[PDB]
Design a protein around this nucleic acid. Structure first.
Ligand SMILES: Nc1nc2c(ncn2[C@@H]2O[C@H](COP(=O)(O)OP(=O)(O)O)[C@@H](O)[C@H]2O)c(=O)[nH]1
Length: 488
RNA sequence: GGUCGGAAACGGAGCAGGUCAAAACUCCCGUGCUGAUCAGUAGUGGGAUCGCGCCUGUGAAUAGCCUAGCGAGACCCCGUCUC
């Protein structure tokens, strides 16, 4: 949401930074935590329940004086939110080497067609073999939309323009794809409302014909009070075990999702805040709440870095210490940046300034602009990529700039800008190599001295940018965050 | 890949990497010329030729040998004289 967390985060800061904390401060700070929940479309009775749940969870009346009050008061509300969002039932996860079939249900316009592509692309990126099934025969041009999205996501799909019965086409698609031993088979179902009994029974017919391993209900975040009535009715007929929340960018912020969880006792697997297929984020329970309290996930980021799994770390270190920074290494670093995933999630997980800093309006196309860097650098040959310094060689023969511009677009100014960026990065790497022993390997210098670390910190603080270093936390804050990444 | 045209299909130039019966350069074997390095390769022209096997005659010559004597002297004996 990136907005409720700020309000809730400011409520916890109001409770803290006070010469004293009595029974009046708690209530005062609890009012700010209630108003924020009310703005999140949550029922007033549930809010009055969380307020009473945290009141009994932290009694200052007979609280053993001498124990951290704030620490156990901020943790009392963190457990409340987590509980408020955790159903308590373990989710379903497909097994390797077995055909797992997932059936999607939801209302019209919920985004099931896009959800199929998002889930399929996520599993394909993770390494799963997946295929698409289009069992929509009521929405006009639904198969065309699914086909174009699938060929955009290079994911196999099945369907037919002329077939009108969704049961037969879905069953035959599953039967066809089970022959070639496909692991994940997701079937796209047309929109449906509980008021219409014909499609209501068609849903049971397709469910019995396919027998999905798990049923996923797609719920938009912009709907209001009408969510519970349809969700309970849908669960009463089919075995819904998980749900996916879409349109997180909406103003309604999915306030009915908490009541849906309290009703169905099922968790949300993923959330999507963008129309684009690549916008797909997990809904891990503990990290989501930890983000709301300025306690960003550290395990998730290190897990992502481990997924990056750099092949070697010794030859790179000795290259850096000698002050060599080539173009091919820069291209590999950019490739790792692209493979790192969405850019917003990288800095969202840090305990730093906040998660509502990466705006979708401009940085989404800024990533595509950065994509042009590899296009420009792909015109470089092996001699240029492996050269010790590209600026020196590029300053001797201008015709190589023309050759590079041949493969790429104009690039007359773009090549010069890329060379300036490479020169700045090369000087940064030269200084990092001149720090004289801040890297692993070689000698057994496991512990780093404070003097060399101070010199490196001074060098780092002088070249990043203004207005972001001051809010980072200063030298002490930056070093503490780096230590957090070390231990975490 | 990117880029340009084209609603699309598709088409043009062309970079990164790779390929050669058809840009150019160069190497090897062979061919022609030119040098230098050369000895368990011949061939007479000399030098040299106490030893070496060498093809050889016409001749009567070549090799091997050649103490003692004389004149004077102490004591003794033999003859003569004196007291
Ligand atoms: N804002 C936002 N819109 C979304 C998201 N996912 C899907 N949509 C919208 O959902 C529409 C597609 O819905 P559709 O798949 O046809 O729903 P269905 O007819 O029930 O299958 C698209 O026009 C998107 O604009 C999301 O994460 N954020």
């Amino acid at each position: 949401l990136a907005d409720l967390g700020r309000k809730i985060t400011s409520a916890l800061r109001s409770l803290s930074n006070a010469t004293i904390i009595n029974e009046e401060v708690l209530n005062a700070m609890l009012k700010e935590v209630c108003t924020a929940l009310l703005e999140a479309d949550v029922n007033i009775k549930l809010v009055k329940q969380l307020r009473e749940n945290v009141k009994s969870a932290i009694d200052l009346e007979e609280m053993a004086s001498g124990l951290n009050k704030r620490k156990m008061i901020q943790h009392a509300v963190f457990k409340e939110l987590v509980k408020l969002v955790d159903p308590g039932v373990k989710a379903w996860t497909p097994t390797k080497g077995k055909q797992n079939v997932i059936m999607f249900v939801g209302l019209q316009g919920s985004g099931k067609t896009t959800t199929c592509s998002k889930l399929a692309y996520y599993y394909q990126r993770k390494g799963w073999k997946t295929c698409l099934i289009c069992a929509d025969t009521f929405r006009a041009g639904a198969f065309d939309q699914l086909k174009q999205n699938a060929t955009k996501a290079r994911i196999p799909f099945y369907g037919s323009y002329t077939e009108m019965d969704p049961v037969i086409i879905a069953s035959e698609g599953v039967e066809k794809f089970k022959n070639e031993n496909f692991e994940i088979i997701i079937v796209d179902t047309s929109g449906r409302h509980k008021q219409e009994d014909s499609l209501f029974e068609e849903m049971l017919q397709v469910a019995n014909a396919i027998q999905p391993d798990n049923i996923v209900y797609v719920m938009d975040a912009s709907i209001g009070q009408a969510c519970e009535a349809q969700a309970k009715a849908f669960k009463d007929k089919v075995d819904v075990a998980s749900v996916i929340v879409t349109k997180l960018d909406g103003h309604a912020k999915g306030g009915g999702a908490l009541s849906a969880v309290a009703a169905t006792k099922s968790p949300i697997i993923f959330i999507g805040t963008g129309e684009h297929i690549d916008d797909f984020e997990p809904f891990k329970t503990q990290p989501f709440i930890s983000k709301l309290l300025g306690m960003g996930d550290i395990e998730g980021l290190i897990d992502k870095v481990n997924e990056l799994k750099l092949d070697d770390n010794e030859a790179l270190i000795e290259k850096l210490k000698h002050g060599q920074f080539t173009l091919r290494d820069m291209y590999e670093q950019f490739q790792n940046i692209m493979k790192m995933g969405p850019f917003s999630q990288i800095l969202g997980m840090i305990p730093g300034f906040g998660t509502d800093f990466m705006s979708k309006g401009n940085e989404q196309e800024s990533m595509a602009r950065l994509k042009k860097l590899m296009t420009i650098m792909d015109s470089m040959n092996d001699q240029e990529l492996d050269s010790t310094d590209g600026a020196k060689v590029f300053s001797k023969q201008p015709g190589r700039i023309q050759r590079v511009a041949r493969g790429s677009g104009v690039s007359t100014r773009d090549v010069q800008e890329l060379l300036t960026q490479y020169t700045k990065f090369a000087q940064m790497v030269k200084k990092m190599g001149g720090i004289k022993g801040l890297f692993k390997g070689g000698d057994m210098s496991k512990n780093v001295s404070q003097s060399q670390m101070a010199k490196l910190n001074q060098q780092m603080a002088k070249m990043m940018d203004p207005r972001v270093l001051h809010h980072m936390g200063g030298m002490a804050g930056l070093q503490s965050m780096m230590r957090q990444f070390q231990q975490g």
